[PDB]
Amino acid sequence: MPKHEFSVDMTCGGCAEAVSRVLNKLGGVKYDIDLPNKKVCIESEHSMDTLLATLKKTGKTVSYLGLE
Amino acid sequence: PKHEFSVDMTCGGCAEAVSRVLNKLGGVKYDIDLPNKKVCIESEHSMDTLLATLKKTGKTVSYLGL
Ligand SMILES: OC[C@H]1O[C@@](CO)(O[C@H]2O[C@H](CO)[C@@H](O)[C@H](O)[C@H]2O)[C@@H](O)[C@@H]1O
């Protein structure tokens, strides 16, 4: 239910696909990826901690833009 | 031991991401070739560990050999 927003420095479509893959693997998420604006929105019951950790697995620089 | 992997990187940012996860793992010496989508790693870590570390990035990875 909570709606989180993250900054992920994706710089190509492949970067976006990889973010998609780690989120798909985690599961229990509803996400939206805005490549041009380096933003990823995630609606999930998973803690912000878990979402942050999952996104960091990509090797990309990740920051929190907060709750919607 | 020098392992070679195929990693589907499509921009400099993709290579940097690979570099960061390998650095986090530690104990590795590596070289990344973006145009040829290849990553070579010399480390004491096992085959599976290196593979899992690369796979967790969300990129398509396959082992090529030694
Ligand atoms: O995802 C990046 C990857 O896409 C390719 C096509 O395989 O190029 C596309 O994306 C570029 C931006 O990253 C565009 O400039 C280009 O016009 C478009 O075809 C690869 O060249 C690139 O590695």
UniProtKB/Swiss-Prot annotation, chain A:
It comes from the Eukaryota. GO terms for biological process: copper ion export; copper ion transport; intracellular copper ion homeostasis; negative regulation of apoptotic process; response to oxidative stress. Cu cation binds at residues 12, 15. InterPro entries: Copper_transport_ATOX1-like (IPR051881), Heavy-metal-associated_CS (IPR017969), HMA_dom (IPR006121), HMA_dom_sf (IPR036163). Gene3D superfamilies: 3.30.70.100. The modification Phosphoserine is found at residue 47. GO terms for cellular component: cytosol. Keywords: Acetylation, Chaperone, Copper, Copper transport, Ion transport, Metal-binding, Phosphoprotein, Transport. Coiled coil: none annotated. Belongs to the ATX1 family. Homodimer. Interacts with ATP7B. Interacts with ATP7A. Interacts (via dimer form) with SLC31A1 (via C-terminal domain); this interaction improves ATOX1 stability and controls intracellular Cu(I) levels. The heavy-metal-associated domain (HMA) coordinates a Cu(+) ion via the cysteine residues within the CXXC motif. The transfer of Cu(+) ion from ATOX1 to ATP7A involves the formation of a three-coordinate Cu(+)-bridged heterodimer where the metal is shared between the two metal binding sites of ATOX1 and ATP7A. The Cu(+) ion appears to switch between two coordination modes, forming two links with one protein and one with the other. Cisplatin, a chemotherapeutic drug, can bind the CXXC motif and hinder the release of Cu(+) ion. This is Copper transport protein ATOX1. The lineage of its organism: Eukaryota, Metazoa, Chordata, Craniata, Vertebrata. The gene is ATOX1.
